[PDB]
Design a protein around this ligand. Structure first.
Ligand SMILES: OC[C@H]1O[C@H](O[C@H]2O[C@H](CO)[C@@H](O)[C@H](O)[C@H]2O)[C@H](O)[C@@H](O)[C@@H]1O
Ligand SMILES: OC[C@H]1O[C@H](O[C@H]2O[C@H](CO)[C@@H](O)[C@H](O)[C@H]2O)[C@H](O)[C@@H](O)[C@@H]1O
Ligand SMILES: OC[C@H]1O[C@@H](O)[C@H](O)[C@@H](O)[C@@H]1O
Ligand SMILES: OC[C@H]1O[C@H](O)[C@H](O)[C@@H](O)[C@@H]1O
Ligand SMILES: [Mg+2]
Length: 580
């Protein structure tokens, strides 16, 4: 009996009318005294309906250009479905009914079947567009990933950016392509049997192009702040519906299979029904199989068990892994010892911090909650993602950090890709890409200068505002064809094939998973009715024979995969083997 709060009849923004009657324009404003729509250059006074609601229908169709005029001030539509001249410009009317979908036989993807591949549209290809990205879909399918995780697409200011400065949440960022180019990308992925997930940012708006306060200051609150401005007020139903409307758009209208909610700890809401709960209600009302993941550092199972999200990006695994390989201790890396015993524990528990004191200076508190309620697929694990690369001063990848070998990098892949937790890969990870993923932006004027200065002071650091920083982060596809890149790629292919094919690795129950260590050798054991598998990873500096590893069970004898392609059951420094 949950009823969506959304009715296409009353949708804010510009919506094509039935029977070729044109377009219905609607907005909410709490403060304007005069209200008009300017369509293709001509102003028309809008009708006041009460509650600050304004409406007008005109015989203009899809492609018409418009913005609103509030007390005589031309103001972009926060509900714009496309912004071909960027975030300060006219919106375009978009008709979602016109695209010829061919994906009727696609029915989404379960979390337990996801192997995520995180894509940044602007750097994934030379062109940095959906159309170029679509041409790489067969490669991704053959690689063995099953779900593309697309970094945010909401329009932001400038000609490149990560996407976290999104300001017009309903409008796909024009430099990447037109709405129909995005649809073409999703449709193509579905035809290849790949899921497509979108990163969405419901905890803040970017600093340039967010005009919501021009309509109603009450979308926001001074009670708390975001990175960029006033906090998003989830006590205000129009603010609630701005994001639930947006979620429903991406899933229903663009055929996304799921959403990754950025920084959920900062979606502050003291309402009886939390916004996260209402988001899950709203997306499920669509009557599909769409998923919701949270990027949440609190180690809080209630995200799944109470808000009814599907899973959580849980960095404890990532952090324990990186500290194991580098020994680094800056910032949140100080929360982890690393090493075989530490990794065994973190995997055993899903996340490490279940309520114990987090001693990181400046952040001290009792962090996390018991993980018992959560099942293996509920944890999303990785050894690389946009933040864990880009939030480093030089944006270097794991194999490029000081004191990491390619052997260790390959061992880390075997651990990640054989665990029953839901894995994510960052673009180019699979071939040990030579290119960094640096923080880049392209804000205007004083704001751009402030970003450059901010980055410099925070940590030569590449200037986020420089074109070179963006270009240096572009994938070099040709390099995967050779040398160690090709070697790494072969291993990734073999691992993803084993994950797909191996009847014991199909396990998705923490009940069947055990871990432990002998010195610097980590072991991870899976036992089901289909058989037994053991992953051994030598995290030491010396050579270890599998036969000499002390285990509380008899080690299986058949060598299924060795990260360095060795014939014998022996582990060089940093190497791993799967036995069965
Ligand atoms: O404060 C948030 C929640 O804390 C508890 O929930 C966590 O801890 C429980 C045991 O301490 C677990 O059973 C549960 O799965 C965790 O989410 C508390 O039980 C919840 O009511 C609180 O909302
Ligand atoms: O060598 C001095 C450091 O030894 C430990 O850190 C190393 O050993 C860990 C396993 O116990 C690894 O995860 C880490 O990468 C190594 O640097 C100790 O934990 C550190 O505090 C010492 O500085
Ligand atoms: O992973 C734990 C870390 O998550 C980060 O995203 C938080 O901003 C930081 O405060 C915390 O140290
Ligand atoms: O501004 C007048 C009213 O507008 C809308 O109803 C908002 O949902 C409400 O919270 C506000 O009180
Ligand atoms: Mg020993």
């Amino acid at each position: 009996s949950f009823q969506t709060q959304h009715d296409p009849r009353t949708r804010l923004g510009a919506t094509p009318l039935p029977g070729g009657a044109g377009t219905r324009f609607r907005l909410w404003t709490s403060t304007a005294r005069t209200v008009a729509v300017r369509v293709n250059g001509t102003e028309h006074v809008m009708t006041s309906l009460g509650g600050g609601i304004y409406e007008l229908e005109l015989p203009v169709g899809p492609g018409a250009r418009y913005l609103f005029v509030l007390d005589g001030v031309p103001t972009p539509d926060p509900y714009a479905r496309f912004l071909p001249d960027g975030v300060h410009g006219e919106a375009e009317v978009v008709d979602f009914g016109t695209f010829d979908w061919t994906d009727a036989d696609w029915h989404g993807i379960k979390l337990a079947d996801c192997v995520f591949y995180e894509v940044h549209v602007g750097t994934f290809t030379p062109e940095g567009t959906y159309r170029a990205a679509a041409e790489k879909l067969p490669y991704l399918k053959e690689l063995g990933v099953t779900a593309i995780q697309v970094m945010p697409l909401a329009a932001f200011d400038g000609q490149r950016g990560w996407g976290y400065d999104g300001a017009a949440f309903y409008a796909p960022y024009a430099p990447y392509g037109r709405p129909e180019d995005l649809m073409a990308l999703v449709d193509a992925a579905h035809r290849l049997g790949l899921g497509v997930f979108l990163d969405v940012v419901y905890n803040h708006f970017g600093p340039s192009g967010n005009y919501l306060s021009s309509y109603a200051p009450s979308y926001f609150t001074d009670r708390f702040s975001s990175a960029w401005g006033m906090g998003l007020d989830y006590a205000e139903p129009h603010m609630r519906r701005y994001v639930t409307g947006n979620a429903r758009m991406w899933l229903r209208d663009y055929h996304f299979d799921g959403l990754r909610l950025d920084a959920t700890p900062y979606m502050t809401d003291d309402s009886e029904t939390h916004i996260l709960t209402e988001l899950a209600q709203e997306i499920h009302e669509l009557g599909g199989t769409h998923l919701l993941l949270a990027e949440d550092h609190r180690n809080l199972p209630d995200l799944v068990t109470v808000n009814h999200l599907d899973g959580i990006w849980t960095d404890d695994f990532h952090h324990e892994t990186r500290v194991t390989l580098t020994g680094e201790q800056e910032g949140y890396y100080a929360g982890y010892r690393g090493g075989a015993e530490a990794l065994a524990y973190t995997i055993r528990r899903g996340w490490r911090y279940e309520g114990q004191f987090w001693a990181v200076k400046g952040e001290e508190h009792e962090r996390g909650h018991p993980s018992d309620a959560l099942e293996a697929p509920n944890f999303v694990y990785c050894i690389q993602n946009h933040d864990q690369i880009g939030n480093r001063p030089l944006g270097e990848r794991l194999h490029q950090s000081d004191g990491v070998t390619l052997h260790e990098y390959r061992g880390a892949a075997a651990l990640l890709l054989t665990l029953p937790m839901t894995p994510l890969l960052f673009q180019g990870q699979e071939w040990a890409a030579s290119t960094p993923f640096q923080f880049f932006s392209d804000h205007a004027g004083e704001l751009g200068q402030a970003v450059s200065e901010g980055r410099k002071k925070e940590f030569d650091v590449p200037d986020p505002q420089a074109e070179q920083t963006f270009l240096n982060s572009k994938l070099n596809w040709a390099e995967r064809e050779g040398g160690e890149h090709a070697r790494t790629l072969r291993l990734y292919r073999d691992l993803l094939r084993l994950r797909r094919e191996d009847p014991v690795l199909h396990n998705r129950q923490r009940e069947n998973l055990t871990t432990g260590h002998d010195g610097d050798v980590l072991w991870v054991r899976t036992v089901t009715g289909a058989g037994e598998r053991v992953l051994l990873w030598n995290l030491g500096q010396d050579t270890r024979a599998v036969a000499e590893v002390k285990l509380p069970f008899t080690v299986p004898r058949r060598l299924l995969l060795h990260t360095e392609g060795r014939e014998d059951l022996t582990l060089g420094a940093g190497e791993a083997v799967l036995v069965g």
